[PDB]
Amino acid sequence: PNNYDEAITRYFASKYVRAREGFQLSEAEYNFRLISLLSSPEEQNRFAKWYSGNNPESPQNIYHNMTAKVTIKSISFLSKDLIQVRYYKTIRELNGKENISHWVSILNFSYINAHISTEDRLINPLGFQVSEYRSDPEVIK
């Protein structure tokens, strides 16, 4: 289809934000692949440049030797193709210290019917594609 039930979109938007804004070394290869499959080509390129170890703000750098786990608070539809995802991150240091921070992502998505490999299709079975994306901290402390 062109579109799916909002719960399906919430499911994939949750997957997307958890994978993109979290960081755990053991899941990192998978998460990068997942975000890449779930992004338009243009957004994937933007994501990859951001994620590169060359970028000072890359999660590979800012969360080096840390874990960051995302908990989704809410997903709101601003329109048929535009959502707001509020979440928090729990960041754990090597010393065990945890910090919680609050964030919101805004993203534009669609579903594209394409033929891709069976393996990739099972990760993204409905062709979910994020075309534009931002994530900002919220004022909540």
The CB density around residue 54, as the number of other CB atoms within 10 Å, is 10
Helix (H) or strand (E) holding 38: none
What is the count of structural domains for the chain? 1
User: Residue 18's Cα: distance from chain center in Å?
Assistant: 5
Can you tell me whether residue 19 is helix, strand or coil? helix
> Which CA distances in Å does 40 have to 27, 59, 66, 89, 141?
22, 21, 29, 25, 33
Phi, psi for 20 (deg, rounded to 5) = -80, -35
User: What domain range includes position 53?
Assistant: 1-141
Instruction: Report residue 141 as tokens.
Output: 């402390």
Phi, psi for 119 (deg, rounded to 5) = -60, -50
| CATH number of the domain residue 12 falls in | 3.10.450.230
Q: Is 57 left (phi over 0), alpha (psi -120 to 50) or beta?
A: alpha
Way the structure was solved = X-ray
What are the DSSP calls for 102-131, one per residue?
EEEEEEEEEE------HHHHHHSTT-EEEE
Q: Are 67 and 92 in contact (CB under 8 A)?
A: yes
Burial 91-114 (b: 16+ CB within 10 A, else e): beeeeeeeeeeebbbebbbebeee
